[PDB]
Design a protein around this ligand. Structure first.
Ligand SMILES: CC(C)C[C@H](CNC(=O)CCCN)Cc1ccc2c(c1C(=O)O)OCO2
Ligand SMILES: CC(C)C[C@H](CNC(=O)CCCN)Cc1ccc2c(c1C(=O)O)OCO2
Lengths: 149, 149
């Protein structure tokens, strides 16, 4: 069910890891900076996400997170169906690749306004979610979910 | 105005600080655990919040955060109108007091399922936002904002 489908995405910058969740139908994102991708960090990120939006299904970003007993525990706790992130539809790869490039571009544009990478990432999330393309990703996710309710 | 109005709230547990943002019209919350309330932490919290929901006005929780140059910078950056949290309507105090008590109750109910307080707080956010009272706070915030769009 489209309103509840999210995709995990992990990208790298400044020797750190940026963990991203994308709401597939809208392009809306949430992101955090972590020292490295672990099952524990991914699990905690999902708990946060699921308390904020009605997360039904998550396409996990890799096999280690898919396998992680802590990720499995969090998905159980939060009522999330854990699925693989295998792009059966092959355009899914390019969309995420493009989003990572786009996010890094925005991060570079704001980078000098913040001391810490985590702050620049949140500024980039803001800009991404507010950008009109016409509705913004923030507007689309709200409309999609409201219609579903 | 109503769709974009949030209230900051700071409460204490286990020698730590729980920073809460409440969407006044719906009762929907976002929360984080921090070692202590500083302007820096409050500012960062607001940047995160504003990238995720259309935050127009924030009733700050105290005068130190209202005054903080870092909080002011974040509100400027994110297009947030910073206001005081003075309850001209005196029922506002009791509503927040009650929410803090309610949150702590839920935290106590989940506390043994997580090692770390921050995790229990996110579990409590989840339970709070999903609880049907009939719509949940999560459903109400989405409806309110969608209608506004
Ligand atoms: C709001 C922005 C224009 C300036 C804030 C204040 N920053 C500055 O004024 C310094 C910018 C000069 N390079 C950024 C900020 C807010 C809150 C934080 C931060 C940072 C950050 O700088 O990363 O770290 C964690 O908590
Ligand atoms: C999902 C929950 C039932 C179990 C997770 C795994 N926890 C356990 O199984 C231990 C439970 C001990 N009572 C909780 C968890 C997930 C992710 C984290 C955590 C914690 C946490 O425990 O606080 O800390 C930071 O990152």
């Amino acid at each position: 069910s489209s309103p509840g489908i999210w995709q995990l995405d992990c990208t790298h910058l400044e020797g750190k890891v940026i963990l991203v969740a994308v709401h597939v139908a809208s392009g809306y994102i949430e992101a955090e900076v972590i020292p490295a991708e672990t099952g524990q960090e991914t699990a905690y990120f999902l708990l946060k996400l699921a308390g904020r939006w009605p997360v039904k299904t998550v396409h996990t970003d890799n096999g280690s997170n898919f396998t992680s007993t802590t990720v499995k525990a969090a998905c159980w706790w939060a009522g999330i169906k854990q699925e693989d992130g295998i792009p059966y539809n092959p355009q899914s790869q390019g969309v995420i690749e493009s989003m990572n490039k786009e996010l890094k571009k925005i991060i570079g544009q704001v980078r000098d306004q913040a001391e810490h990478l985590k702050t620049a990432v949140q500024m980039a999330v803001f800009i991404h979610n507010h950008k009109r393309k016409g509705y913004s990703a923030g507007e689309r996710i709200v409309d999609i979910i409201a219609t579903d309710i």
